[PDB]
Amino acid sequence: QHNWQVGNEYTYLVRSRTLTSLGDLSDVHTGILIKALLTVQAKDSNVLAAKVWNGQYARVQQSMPDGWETEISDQMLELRDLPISGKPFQIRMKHGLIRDLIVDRDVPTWEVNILKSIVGQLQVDTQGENAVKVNSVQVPTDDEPYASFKAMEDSVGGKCEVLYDIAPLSDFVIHRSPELVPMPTLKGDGRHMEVIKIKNFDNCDQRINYHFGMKFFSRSSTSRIVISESLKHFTIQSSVTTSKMMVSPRLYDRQNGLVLSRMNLTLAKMEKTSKPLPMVDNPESTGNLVYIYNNPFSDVEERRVSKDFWQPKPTLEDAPQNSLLPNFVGYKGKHIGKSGKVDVINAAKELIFQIANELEDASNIPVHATLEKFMILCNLMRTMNRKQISELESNMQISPNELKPNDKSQVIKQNTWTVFRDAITQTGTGPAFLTIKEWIERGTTKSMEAANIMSKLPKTVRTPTDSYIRSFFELLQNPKVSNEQFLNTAATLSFCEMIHNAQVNKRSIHNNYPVHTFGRLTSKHDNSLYDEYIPFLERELRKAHQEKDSPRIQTYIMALGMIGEPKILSVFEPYLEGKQQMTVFQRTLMVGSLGKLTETNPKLARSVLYKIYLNTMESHEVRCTAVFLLMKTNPPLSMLQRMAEFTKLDTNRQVNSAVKSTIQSLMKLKSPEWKDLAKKARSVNHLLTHHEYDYELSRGYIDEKILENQNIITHMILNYVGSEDSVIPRILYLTWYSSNGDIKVPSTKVLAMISSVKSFMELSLRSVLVPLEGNLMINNKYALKFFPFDKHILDKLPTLISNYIEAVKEGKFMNVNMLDTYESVHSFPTETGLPFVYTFNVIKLTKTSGTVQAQINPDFAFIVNSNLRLTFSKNVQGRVGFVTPFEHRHFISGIDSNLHVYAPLKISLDVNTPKGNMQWKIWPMKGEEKSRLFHYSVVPFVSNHDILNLRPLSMEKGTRPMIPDDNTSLALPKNEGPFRLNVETAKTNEEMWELIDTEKLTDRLPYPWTMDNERYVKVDMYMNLEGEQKDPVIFSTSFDSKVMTRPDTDSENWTPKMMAVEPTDKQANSKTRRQEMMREAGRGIESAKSYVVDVRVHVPGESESETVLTLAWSESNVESKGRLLGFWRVEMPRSNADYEVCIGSQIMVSKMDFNVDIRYG
Ligand SMILES: *[C@@H]1O[C@H](CO)[C@@H](O[C@@H]2O[C@H](CO)[C@@H](O[C@@H]3O[C@H](CO[C@H]4O[C@H](CO)[C@@H](O)[C@H](O)[C@@H]4O)[C@@H](O)[C@H](O[C@H]4O[C@H](CO)[C@@H](O)[C@H](O)[C@@H]4O)[C@@H]3O)[C@H](O)[C@H]2NC(C)=O)[C@H](O)[C@H]1NC(C)=O
């Protein structure tokens, strides 16, 4: 109860430290230490006077072999003053506990947070004031040092549950450690005690964190407090806290990233007061001991303190207000642009110009670190308002309508436009969306560029509010978007995806957006959805159905499907029942669009899908979809039992094959997710039919790849619906997961459909009832795309091809660039009072540049002289660390990786229609004789840099890569050759990397996927003098008329044994390929017209390898199939290897084909 006495002055020693490290990889730590003093005076019953006055801190980047808890003498540290004002403040007490603090208004919020952390260690609850219904058991106690209750205490990390335990202190411990009891004469007639607190962060009331994504963290807070005489009238002697955070840097590693912290107080003096502390000027309450936010863009301090501790909802003109990320609280708790050394507009301009200039020298992209610059730019523009964006756009003089993209002189301008467009697409704020809206309104972006812009918005928006969606709706109503067919689909799908992820799915609402910083994004009282949006889509669907336009119907069906609200069932009801006519493809799309309803409302979705299944009058491509969808809802045992029993009397082969394959393949699933369903499938197996179906029928299939060593499970779900006319199935479902622990990366799913394969084949052959309909969908982490098509687009395609051919006659220049990013941030305060930041980034690039000119002739000579460049890069960054606002510094431990592919090449295709000769030529271009073609490095590091400097970390003097002591280097090409390969791996014992590079073992696997992906590697594949090559790499391909002989077809014996035609194909010549063409086509010719495709791949130079190939067969319904073809003979002109592997298949059964494996020489 009475922790303190009136008229006494307590002096405490303050010690703390916060460090980051790479874990078991290295023993190098980066961080800071703090030393200070705390003075507390008890002047009244519930009024305390406090002051923290001495302040010193130092930065450490060392190796700590013994441990992070070791003492470091002041003679080994460079100490600096801590910019905190030693202004007195007041602590208000209630029932022996800390209630709130009173601080002068002219004090920064970060200082208030540090004081919260310091004072939170004086909070001892011995009488169970924060009762958790366990203090009643402790009530009948009298002089009992033992107590093991539970409570709910206050700390900078939040207001979370804490476990208590009290027991007396023995004299042996005190003798070993005099540090615990500085002055021991204060116990008087009592005894010493120990209090241990263990903090649980799972269940908790007040939470403060920032999130954006789509449990790997590990928090552990413990305390150790020693108190003097009595459990009611005592004195605090020492208090220490210890916290630890563990993160896997790249989501698939062994949890190596650490952040550690501690706070320390030891009593120094206690004596009667002589001079009192001055009263607090300009008082104001700071709430409880929990972290508080700030206004980043305000000139004066503005604290949101509960008495709702929540930042205001983002608007559509001003920047969002966050208080846990480096760009918002780095500069003394305020915005970075307030520094003066940083002007946002000029920084953005310089970064854009640098990125645009560096894209011309693509072979040096990894060296210059362009993609890291792109990420820095995207981070920087999230702190801009619309006025600043408009000023920047006007200042860079961008007018793509005026600019000519086809001119080689104007390349940097187009690159600036491209980089700026990509950066705004990835910004994700309100001003960015206003900028995009203004662009589309005026006409700066028209069809495909705008469709690409809209395709990425749902995957990059961070704060989807009501105003954001209202503006999106207003944009959807625009004449320009509505009239264009391609832009409309992208815009509508993105709108519906955002609606769903922001309002419908509670899991999406809570676990994907920073709710604990801004509150719930959309108020539950907003009836805008049901009164405005869904009726609009219903009207549009009705109009589209009336006019009989396939792509519009498909777009609105997908749009209503992706919402996932139960009202879409009433929306779809008139079409499903049969009052309104609809085709089978459209009905299948409607039934498959119900996927997100199964995730959110499993019972109702199960009811409707089972009702669809039980009907025997629906087409099989409806019921198969119903089966494939039901098993995503975890049915009960009776359901599966009845479904399995149904197979005996069911009269459809497709449905039975679907259910049997799904149930049988649902057995081997020994995973934490499908365990119960696997057991149910095992229990029901003994009732399925004994009939077996061919692989051409509809079948589902699930792959489980469980790896105990890697602790990662990879899944693979494949559903396809067979057809009664062609072997190729009509509909294909494909999905890839990647689960490690509990967190999963967003999945990649592909959907392909077509109404009739025979119709598609007939249209394809003609170019050289049920309408032709089809669509393709790719939904991955980067964008959502949907291409629906009808017969009109198929008939328009040849016109576009002819127009392109006639337009590239004189010569055309092309410049296509593409940039994509992926983000995931997680931030929360530590137990010292400082932000903790975790980031995971991926950046991609696909650049295709060069001049292309063609020619077409009445002789059908499609003569082309192409000249291209090809590039692909990928950067992956994973970082963990913390920020110190009082010096704008950021401490990072992480691993970065790179991958780079460059394809400088020149092509001359001379394909002739009358005679199937398509002779290519591949050259190295002039001035590019020596160039880099490959790069792959993985680099772990510890960094200590300044936020005001917007530069890649590789150029910062504080960064330190982890180079092993015994690093070595290898140059694989033994002597002079065409190719140069370097490996700069280290430790001479990685084995998995220096064995795949041996290139002398035949059994060695060339695949490098199976390797340790956490080590310093660096590989470069250069090229020395392959250029200036007059001799080309001939790639000549011939063709055959595919004739057949009737006498040989009749009375032709069929045997499983396969003969070898190698002696007949001894001559490896394209001209001699005509001689061998008759033998290959003639063999096994039973009313079949099969041609031969012979390629003569020839490589000139010092080493020549005349690789040859032959595919001579075709698929015919009348024929018995079985392809006899294939031989790869490689001859060295100097030392002939004569590697001549051959294959073949003459089974002629339509069931095992006998294939010869190899034959050497
Ligand atoms: C919370 O913070 C407080 C201080 O803010 C820490 O208290 C300190 O704890 C350390 C370690 O327990 C103490 O260090 C020990 O000091 C002893 C006395 O130092 C000298 O004192 C005088 C000079 O003033 C000399 O005349 C005398 O002869 C002593 O030499 C040392 O004897 C101890 O030596 C230990 O280390 C050496 C070298 O490794 C070994 O050879 C020894 O065998 C022995 O293990 C030791 O250095 C320090 O005194 C404490 N400070 C105070 C003010 O009491 C708490 O430890 C901290 N809490 C946590 C959890 O870290």
From Swiss-Prot:
It is found in: Secreted. The keyword Transit peptide does not apply. This is Vitellogenin. Disulfide bonds join 160-204. Residues 4-732 form the Vitellogenin domain. Keywords: Disulfide bond, Glycoprotein, Secreted, Signal, Storage protein. Induction: By MRJP1 during the differentiation of honeybee larvae into queens. Its main location: secreted. Glycans are attached at residues 264, 967. Precursor of the egg-yolk proteins that are sources of nutrients during embryonic development. Involved in the differentiation of honeybee larvae into queens. It comes from the Eukaryota. One of its GO terms (cellular component) is extracellular region. Accumulates in the hemolymph. Represents up to 70% of the queen's hemolymph proteins. During the first week of the worker adult life, when it becomes a nurse bee and performs brood-rearing tasks, the vitellogenin titer increases and may account for up to 40% of the total hemolymph proteins. GO terms for molecular function: lipid transporter activity; nutrient reservoir activity.
